[PDB]
Design a protein around this ligand. Sequence first.
Ligand SMILES: [Ca+2]
Ligand SMILES: [Ca+2]
Ligand SMILES: [Ca+2]
Ligand SMILES: [Ca+2]
Ligand SMILES: [Ca+2]
Ligand SMILES: [Ca+2]
Ligand SMILES: [Ca+2]
Ligand SMILES: [Ca+2]
Ligand SMILES: [Ca+2]
Ligand SMILES: [Ca+2]
Ligand SMILES: [Ca+2]
Ligand SMILES: [Ca+2]
Ligand SMILES: [Ca+2]
Ligand SMILES: [Ca+2]
Ligand SMILES: [Ca+2]
Ligand SMILES: [Ca+2]
Ligand SMILES: [Ca+2]
Ligand SMILES: [Ca+2]
Ligand SMILES: [Ca+2]
Ligand SMILES: [Ca+2]
Ligand SMILES: [Ca+2]
Ligand SMILES: [Ca+2]
Ligand SMILES: [Ca+2]
Lengths: 194, 196, 196, 194
Amino acid sequence: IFEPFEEVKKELDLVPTVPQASLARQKYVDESESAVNEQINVEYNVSYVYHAMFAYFDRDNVALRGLAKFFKESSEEEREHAEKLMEYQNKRGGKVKLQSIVMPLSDFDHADKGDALHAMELALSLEKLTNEKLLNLHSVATKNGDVQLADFVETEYLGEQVEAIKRISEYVAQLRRVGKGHGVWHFDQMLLHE
Amino acid sequence: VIFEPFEEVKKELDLVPTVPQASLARQKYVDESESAVNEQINVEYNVSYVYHAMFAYFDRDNVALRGLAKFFKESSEEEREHAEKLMEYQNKRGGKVKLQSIVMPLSDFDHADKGDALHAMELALSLEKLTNEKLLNLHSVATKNGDVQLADFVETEYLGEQVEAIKRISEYVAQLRRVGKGHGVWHFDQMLLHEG
Amino acid sequence: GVIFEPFEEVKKELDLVPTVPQASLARQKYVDESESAVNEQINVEYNVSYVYHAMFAYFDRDNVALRGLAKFFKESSEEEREHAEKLMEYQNKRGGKVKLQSIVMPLSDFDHADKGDALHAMELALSLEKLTNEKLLNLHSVATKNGDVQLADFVETEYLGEQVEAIKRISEYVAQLRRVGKGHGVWHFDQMLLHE
Amino acid sequence: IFEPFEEVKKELDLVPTVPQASLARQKYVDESESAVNEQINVEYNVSYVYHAMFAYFDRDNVALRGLAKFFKESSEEEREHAEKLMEYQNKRGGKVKLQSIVMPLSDFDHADKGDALHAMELALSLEKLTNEKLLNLHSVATKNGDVQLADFVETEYLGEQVEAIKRISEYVAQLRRVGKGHGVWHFDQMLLHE
Ligand SMILES: [Ca+2]
Ligand SMILES: [Ca+2]
Ligand SMILES: [Ca+2]
Ligand SMILES: [Ca+2]
Ligand SMILES: [Ca+2]
Ligand SMILES: [Ca+2]
Ligand SMILES: [Ca+2]
Ligand SMILES: [Ca+2]
Ligand SMILES: [Ca+2]
Ligand SMILES: [Ca+2]
Ligand SMILES: [Ca+2]
Ligand SMILES: [Ca+2]
Ligand SMILES: [Ca+2]
Ligand SMILES: [Ca+2]
Ligand SMILES: [Ca+2]
Ligand SMILES: [Ca+2]
Ligand SMILES: [Ca+2]
Ligand SMILES: [Ca+2]
Ligand SMILES: [Ca+2]
Ligand SMILES: [Ca+2]
Ligand SMILES: [Ca+2]
Ligand SMILES: [Ca+2]
Ligand SMILES: [Ca+2]
């Protein structure tokens, strides 16, 4: 027999009184809170790197407008991934802690591979690294028995990340097939209108 | 790899129940899981009833907090929906729903120190946290018993929603504390009354 | 407070990019056992699609003339092929290699003197759906045992809840067929299904 | 010149009474029924092979999206061809007998020709094989004097098969003209948006 007011007597007492404490926080341990903050920083870093890549391909002497557009839009998307995690942190009553963002590379030319292929391979590696970080976040949730955090990560991030990795892998493959010069420019035109 | 449907189908073909009272659908759904689902149905129905009591209090002419009355009324209906979804789930899995008794709730929600509004929102927050604990319990029963789909159902249909409900009410508690009793509470209530 | 340095940590991720043309660029933490298990499930779904197509072909006979059942099995076959295709697409998303396997010859006749054709076929369909559920849970188990988080989640999300609903749907058909009885009742049930 | 009820009472007593017998079947001999079941299996097999082709070209490292889409659509179309023959079998009161489907090739790479050209040449060969089988089915119908079966095959299948063969032949020719690399990728873009 479940008596709400009997079993809720204790709960009503646990309600925080000091203004700075979260009222919502429940079964959300410090390590989980910190793991979410770490992932916010990972997504924000990738956003920043993509913005650097946009800035490179937007150069008049590089003039790959499709790549510039793709990286510009990707940068915006990554910031949204970071923001979703910041909002999640607050839903669970953790405190968002934005960390420093390191200076990214500015130049993406590559003598052998060519700038386009080099940049897409870097992007692929960045998305694979992001996947590793997400799987680490998931591992922290699972270790700490945080069922809803693990579900949130699976549902909002993991499937999406698999799709992002396949998408970029396909770009790498196509850039390898078309080759430098005319081929790269044409692939770029495709991307511009994709 | 190699797979012969008509050969392997033998197992389950002669496992099709023949007595009218037995579930045809039930598969890898143990009694403990069925019982835990019935327990959660009762938890949700209970919360629905408590919110209905809170509605009835704030709907009093001398209390006259129309925003809170509306919020609790809608919350009661939503809770009943949560119970019903679990009743439907029980039947999807071939378990038998067993509705249990519902206890008489408190009727008065006044509080000298906190004021009625803040007291009731704090109670609502505590009820939602208690419900979260019970939902996570249900998830634990499923995981312990190895019921993959029951665990997935609880996470997917209930857990994220419960986190949202808790933050929502926490924000109400915070605002009520900030505005203070009297004019502030009344103003907060007006906000809640017209809240989108 | 620098806790993450992308260009330092990606160096490993970069010197791991395949240069051999036949190798997947996307594949990451997706082991052979998981790839094999997904290929097995593709074959399970394709086999079920084929069986449903055989059942369609039987109920579409002029002398059987149960148009509702024929329509149901025809649609079920198409849906099952979609289940197979979604797994083929998933295999490629993860950078596994799809390997389609042989499909065995299904039964062609679904007559049954005592149960009647309709009830017999629905009971068979129920058993096939329960069998598929066992197979899906087996796939989930392979993922969980190997620690493939996203594969487990894909199976839960895209297949397991759906399978539970499919099982209840067909269980209800079996129950109704048993209630209405052979002859006029079965024909009437079939009309309902034709227009459901 | 013609009295329906004189000639019909003999026909009326020929109407089957046992529930397992087709009521519709008329002038449809076992050889024709068998030949129709054979063609069902041919079409279903081609459907499966096309699905294998789709699965190959949908690989991230192959990344020919136009070819993948073409083979995916061809697979669905081929299954429809099989289903139409299944429906026809039932119209004539024959009994459909689905047969086993063999494991198809999974890899379609080719060092000399390149993957795209090789796959299109294989597709052309498959469609020519299907055409031969359809013509054989027509031959069986004619040998047995089944006028309507012959007509069904020529009306519903033979013209379509000629179109399919020209279509794929044109793809082979274009792939040969554009050459490997940038050319193949461009052809694939054309096919993707065709
Ligand atoms: Ca991201
Ligand atoms: Ca935004
Ligand atoms: Ca803290
Ligand atoms: Ca999940
Ligand atoms: Ca998702
Ligand atoms: Ca795609
Ligand atoms: Ca609830
Ligand atoms: Ca309702
Ligand atoms: Ca029982
Ligand atoms: Ca889970
Ligand atoms: Ca949810
Ligand atoms: Ca909000
Ligand atoms: Ca299925
Ligand atoms: Ca499809
Ligand atoms: Ca391999
Ligand atoms: Ca689902
Ligand atoms: Ca229903
Ligand atoms: Ca064909
Ligand atoms: Ca169709
Ligand atoms: Ca026969
Ligand atoms: Ca002719
Ligand atoms: Ca024609
Ligand atoms: Ca033309």
